Design a protein around this ligand. Sequence first.
Ligand code: P66
Length: 357
Amino acid sequence: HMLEMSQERPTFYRQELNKTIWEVPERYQNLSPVGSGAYGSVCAAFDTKTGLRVAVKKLSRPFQSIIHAKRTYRELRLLKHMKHENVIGLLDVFTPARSLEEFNDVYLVTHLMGADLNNIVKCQKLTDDHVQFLIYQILRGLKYIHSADIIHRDLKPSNLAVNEDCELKILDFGLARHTDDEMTGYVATRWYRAPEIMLNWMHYNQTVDIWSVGCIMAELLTGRTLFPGTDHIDQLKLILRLVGTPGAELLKKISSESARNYIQSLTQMPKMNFANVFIGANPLAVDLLEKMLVLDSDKRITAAQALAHAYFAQYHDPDDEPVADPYDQSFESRDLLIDEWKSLTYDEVISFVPPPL
Ligand SMILES: O=C(NC1CC1)c1ccc(Cl)c(Nc2nncc3c2cnn3-c2c(F)cccc2F)c1
């Protein structure tokens, strides 16, 4: 058993790209801004050490406030935990800073992907086999994310990244923090959200993400957003029209008195026939869709269970659907100063050990 006693610091070079000065290790070459701001300050690059096309995100002044500092620490902790084919993970993390004292920039390095689901949908008409392989991969990655006791919270086509070979990685898990305005009106930001988080019926858990997969799957099959509500209330009515109004058993699970009061005011509707809604679709696709889009979150199919569904017969491999280690999120309930979040972040950067690729 031999041991490493110190870490080598690479040579860095400077470059002005996003109107900001990027300082990166020599290994990273041909830096080029991607996404026209949709992903933030992200550059595509070639990693000469691994031969990988990579995405490099710069977080400038990430310790400006207590919230920003904790968010910076949260994102890093999240990315360091994920080692899965269908989940975005960390290839590298670096700072040009030689001490904690001068440390005010964090760079994150992930795999470079070709497009998000939104963009591949406008370029192609997806076959049932594409939908099989894409949804299989989302669920495979979700099984892993959920086994680490992490909730995505904001699964939508725009944070599902896809390659030319139809291989998929899940982005933006565990960190989505939206304003009221961003969730207002006729907006994609809300169309995929489970009814219980959209209107805050109860304390939410991972089953929230399965609802989102159901909405995504339906849209891939039909070419149409499943619940494109013009507001929160219009969306809910769309949802209940399809899945029926709550029964007595679900009503008493709704911890919010006011939300329970509003629900009971609505004319009761039965669940529709999904075979008459999703006409011409693989009957197995429709079956799984019914097990995902259940109003009561307790009764929804889980990611692990859905993997064993007959719809994924040609892709399902129980020996190649791995779980994660537990994710220690005890820091979430911790109140700390800016300098304490910064030091914690610095610790995580310098302690990073690269994958054996
Ligand atoms: O999900 C992330 N963080 C949350 C989970 C904690 C996270 C953080 C940093 C980075 Cl660098 C990334 N990776 C990426 N971020 N945006 C777009 C990305 C991408 C990788 N590829 N692409 C990409 C592209 F460059 C062009 C077109 C389509 C694409 F999906 C993800």
